[PDB]
């Protein structure tokens, strides 16, 4: 069985220095880079990909200022950039959701994931125990009473639906290969590589672990020789440009 559709949605965006996106590069100059939910229609149901930016983030560039990351990261997130908007839109409530998939907590991810109290999310252990501690991590993305499914490494969502386990940008992170109806072998590394550049070329970038994030690209590397996906990547304004997105899909 494969995915019957895969949306790529815009959720808003973020302003991030450039070298968030190389870490060779000189801090001075912010990239105004997207936010992305993906939404897959599945035999079983649709499903959910990350969950866009905190209600916080809601015309409020400065939501990081008095913190220890001030000026490194500006929201870029109006009221129609609400998840639940986004949904609503797309014409989904939270409650209609077979699942919820957290790539990882960052805040740009699971900044909306309080809006669905019943839907299970699906996060690794890795990811839950490391938000439940970390300082990057906002309250808004673990919140404590939510259906969360707890996962460890590699797992089968639904069939055409794979999560493959790839820490290093976060102590959790998890990426995706999708099978679609139309288009067959798709690779949504989210933030194992923000640019093309950081998956093909290995140019360092923002994480928690750089030496891991590398050994999960590498893994991904395998995958890719393996299966030939066409390849989306987390936070790149280049592949931004020719990306089908709502209401196309692949
Ligand atoms: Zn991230
Ligand atoms: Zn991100």
Not at 60 to 87: W, Y
Not at 175 to 192: H, M, R, Y
Not at 221 to 237: L, M, R, S, Y
């Amino acid at each position: 069985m494969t995915v019957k559709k895969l949306y790529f949605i815009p959720a808003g965006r973020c302003m991030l220095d450039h070298s968030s996106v190389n870490s060779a590069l000189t801090p001075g100059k912010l990239l105004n880079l997207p936010v992305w939910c993906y939404l897959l229609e599945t035999e079983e149901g649709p499903i959910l990909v990350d969950t866009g930016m905190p209600e916080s983030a809601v015309n409020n560039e400065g939501l990081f200022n008095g913190t220890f990351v001030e000026g490194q990261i500006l929201p870029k997130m109006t009221e129609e950039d609400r998840i639940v908007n986004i949904l609503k839109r797309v014409g989904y409530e939270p409650d209609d959701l077979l699942y919820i998939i957290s790539s990882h907590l960052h805040f740009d991810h699971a900044g909306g994931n309080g809006a669905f109290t019943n839907t299970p999310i699906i996060v690794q252990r890795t990811e839950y125990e490391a938000a439940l501690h970390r300082e990057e991590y906002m309250k808004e993305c673990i919140l404590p009473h939510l259906n969360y499914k707890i996962i460890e490494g590699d797992y089968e969502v639904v069939p055409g639906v794979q999560l493959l386990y790839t820490p290093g940008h976060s102590p959790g992170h998890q990426s995706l290969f999708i099978e679609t109806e139309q288009s067959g072998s798709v690779l949504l590394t989210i933030d194992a590589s923000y640019t093309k550049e950081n998956f093909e070329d290995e140019v360092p970038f923002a994480g928690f672990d750089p030496e891991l994030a590398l050994s999960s690209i590498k893994r991904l590397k395998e995958v890719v020789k393996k299966e030939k996906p066409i390849i989306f990547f987390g936070h790149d304004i280049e592949q931004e440009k020719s990306c089908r997105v709502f209401p196309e899909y692949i």
